[PDB]
Design a protein around this ligand. Structure first.
Ligand SMILES: Nc1ncnc2c1ncn2[C@@H]1O[C@H](COP(=O)(O)O)[C@@H](O)[C@H]1O
Ligand SMILES: [Mg+2]
Length: 329
């Protein structure tokens, strides 16, 4: 009958176990336990007139595309013709109303002490504030936090292959573009699987895991088609999105705008190639590997990833990269 109280999504025990694990301008991400297993809870303030982390809160209408796309992408793990585990599972979505729970404030504070925060301490929300609460599968640790923790160049290659395959499957199934695949949005989790499986237009293939499962998250800017309807975030009048600096990330928003001539409902899967290029650049420039790069085999992978960086912009889509680029043969 409209929203629910926080206690509906976060009963005492689950709340007591919350720890903050990440953030953005959108809001806040906490980890807790459900059914003997970690879960990730994304909490987004909506519909309020107050500026939050420097931005207006989204309306439900502005948030709805992320909710829809989160649900669609969550289905790809079981779909027959086009299948991948390379996105993230969605457990539930709720509209919650209330002030921030004190335990979540203490968890926010703990994070701000240890890691620091770009957001405002969430102690100003009133009893009538609305939030969207998205409960996700716990996907591991983000690539930015792993920038000194990858084992080898083989791991780098595996991550790029996994990312490309995931995006290709979503392209084939949904005419998907991610549109904000910064390295905070690539999650790494240890797996005992040696080979990872995907199906692309009815053809199943595998990818050497190198011990990790990659999960792509955060569909705040994403675009896809579902039942002939294009679901997307229209950023045609956003100015600030295109005036960032200090990181190649901020160039990608401008490069996408160039590619699509500011028509965000159209399908331009080249944007996926652009994000993969930005990620390749991070691997080559902002990362150090536990085993360094000390053997002929590892040195050759590095040269191959460098060549990928220098050639991949001449491919039309994640699908084109997957199916045609030498790095993945
Ligand atoms: N499903 C998830 N599993 C694990 N960590 C997550 C998940 N979703 C978000 N995070 C963390 O929260 C950060 C911000 O989330 P996002 O706003 O979606 O980029 C990410 O960089 C991750 O560190
Ligand atoms: Mg970045």
């Amino acid at each position: 009958k409209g929203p629910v109280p926080f206690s509906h999504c976060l009963p005492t025990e689950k709340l007591q176990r919350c720890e903050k694990i990440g953030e953005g301008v959108f809001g806040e991400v906490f980890q807790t336990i459900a059914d003997h297993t970690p879960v990730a809870i994304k909490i987004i303030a909506i519909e309020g007139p107050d500026l939050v982390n420097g931005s207006h809160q989204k309306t439900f209408e502005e948030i709805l595309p992320e909710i829809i796309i989160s649900k669609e992408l969550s289905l790809l793990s079981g779909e027959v013709c086009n299948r991948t585990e390379g996105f993230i599972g969605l457990n539930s979505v709720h509209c919650v109303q209330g002030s921030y729970p004190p335990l979540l404030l203490k968890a926010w504070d703990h994070y701000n002490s240890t890691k620091g925060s770009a957001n405002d301490r969430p102690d100003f929300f009133k009893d009538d504030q609305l939030f969207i609460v998205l409960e996700f599968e716990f996907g591991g640790i983000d690539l930015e936090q792993m920038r000194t923790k990858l084992s080898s160049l083989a791991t780098a290659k595996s991550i790029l292959h996994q990312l490309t395959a995931s995006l290709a499957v979503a392209e084939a199934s949904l005419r998907f573009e991610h549109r904000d695949l910064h390295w905070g949005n690539v999650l790494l989790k240890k797996t005992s699987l040696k080979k990872l499986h995907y199906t692309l237009n009815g053809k199943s293939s595998t990818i050497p895991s190198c011990g990790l499962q990659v999960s792509i998250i955060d569909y705040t800017l994403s675009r896809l088609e579902r039942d002939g309807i294009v679901v997307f975030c229209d950023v045609s009048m956003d100015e600030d999105l295109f005036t960032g600096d200090g990181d190649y990330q901020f160039d990608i928003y401008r490069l996408m705008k160039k590619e699509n001539n500011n028509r965000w409902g159209e399908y331009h899967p080249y944007s996926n190639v652009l994000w993969l290029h930005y990620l390749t650049d991070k691997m080559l420039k902002q990362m150090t590997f536990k085993t360094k790069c000390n053997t002929p085999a590892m040195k050759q992978i590095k040269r191959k990833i460098q060549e990928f960086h220098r050639t991949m912009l001449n491919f039309s889509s994640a699908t084109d990269l997957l199916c045609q680029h030498s790095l993945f043969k």
